[PDB]
Amino acid sequence: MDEEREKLKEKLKEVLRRAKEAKKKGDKEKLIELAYEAAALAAWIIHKDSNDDEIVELAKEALKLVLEAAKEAKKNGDKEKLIKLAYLAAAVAAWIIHTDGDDDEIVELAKEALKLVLEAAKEAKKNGDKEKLIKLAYLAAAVAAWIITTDGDDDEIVELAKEALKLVLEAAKEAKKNGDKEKLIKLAYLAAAVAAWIIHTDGDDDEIVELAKEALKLVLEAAKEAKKNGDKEKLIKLAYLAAAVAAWIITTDGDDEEIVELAKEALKLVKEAAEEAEKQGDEELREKLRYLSEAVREWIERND
């Protein structure tokens, strides 16, 4: 068998035992320490796809421990341990999502971890740390992107995804001011994916249309940097996102002079990526980029 799976299994089961003892006994700071160790054990024990159900339960119970340690740390008033616990909760959540896909109680646990990170990101802005702001926004968007796919019907998911989109857009602006562009590209990816799912599942309002515009101009500038770094692979996916967001805005809200400008820029981006994908040989992406390019032209050119 896999001796490391077994050791990680009994080691994580140990930490949960000690944590349930420290909670019963009354010491809180060790319960936060044990939460740190439970999260690292959980996220690593599911770092690749596993079939054993016992592995995914310990991960969920570890997440439950992180959330319990998060609500005690908020009452004691330590902001920095609250931010780290919020980071751990979302990271563990999204790794449980990646491995097990969809079970029943991960929806409510990931929703609780999403609200926790949105609070920490607001609190991280109050402290002024840009590194933690980006990572928390990355997690919020990654988690929100999944929840709206599998749930979608819940009313609270809309607001949390909108707050996550608004959050990653701010984090993508400070990442532009730091200098690192690879982090900007990944934040733009999340901005488009979330913006597209929000318009997909819930339609439009005044705020969704404004946020989607910002996510669209964000991925356009990100794909402009991806062309400078000479990376064909991330370029074609960014062009997909640009067209997708532009398509969801036009087909639901319509277009003004601002939207047609961004749509045209995204359209010339897709035609360049459709050329690069046919060179590299991506049959599925080649025919989806043609679908986008045609659908966007038909909508733009209806007043013509």
């Binding site: 740190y36 990654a142 999944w146 796919t149 990944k186 996102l241 989806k288």
Partner: peptide, 19 residues
């Protein structure tokens, strides 16, 4: 030993397209 802190998760799948 003790495993490292949880890394950032992989990116979510691509979103669907309008009808």
């Amino acid at each position: 030993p003790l495993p490292p802190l949880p890394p950032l998760p992989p990116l979510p799948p691509l979103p669907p397209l309008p009808p």
